Amino acid sequence: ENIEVHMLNKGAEGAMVFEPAYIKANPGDTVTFIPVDKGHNVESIKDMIPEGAEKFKSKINENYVLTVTQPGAYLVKCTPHYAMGMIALIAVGDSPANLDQIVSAKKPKIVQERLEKVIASAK
């Protein structure tokens, strides 16, 4: 099935956000990213996607449909606003093997704080 995500300049958690920021899906599902405001895109983060999944990067302002195949956790960012915290976590299948690794990886402090919130309060 399909899960729709919006990219906004301002939302429930503050400025520059993906809503929802926690996406639960299964292999074969699609995630459709819709920039409701301009200036946003979606890009997989290096070493924060599962082992055999392909990297991806959309163009700014375009609607992008991601098909997810490999199970595991994926942290995606908005390229321009990553440093301002704009990320989302996609969890494919149950108990994603790489989730603790992604939570521990090096990333901006603001990113880390939002990630921690979404895993607690968004799961």
Min dist. Cβ of residue 110 to Cu ion (A): 13
Assigned token pair, 46: 């290096």
Shortest Å, Cβ 26 to Cu ion:
27
Please list every residue in the chain followed by a chain break, i.e. its C lies more than 2.5 Å from the next written N: none
Return the residues of window 28-87 that contact Cu ion according to CB under 5 A: 40, 78, 81, 86
* 84 contacts 22 by C-beta, under 8 angstroms: no
Distance (Å, whole) CA 23 – CA 15 = 19
Please indicate if the annotation marks 84 as binding a ligand: no
Q: Which 84-103 positions form the footprint of Cu ion (CB under 5 A)? A: 86
**Closest distance to Cu ion from the beta carbon of 19 (Å):** 12
Using CB under 5 A, list all residues that contact Cu ion: 40, 78, 81, 86
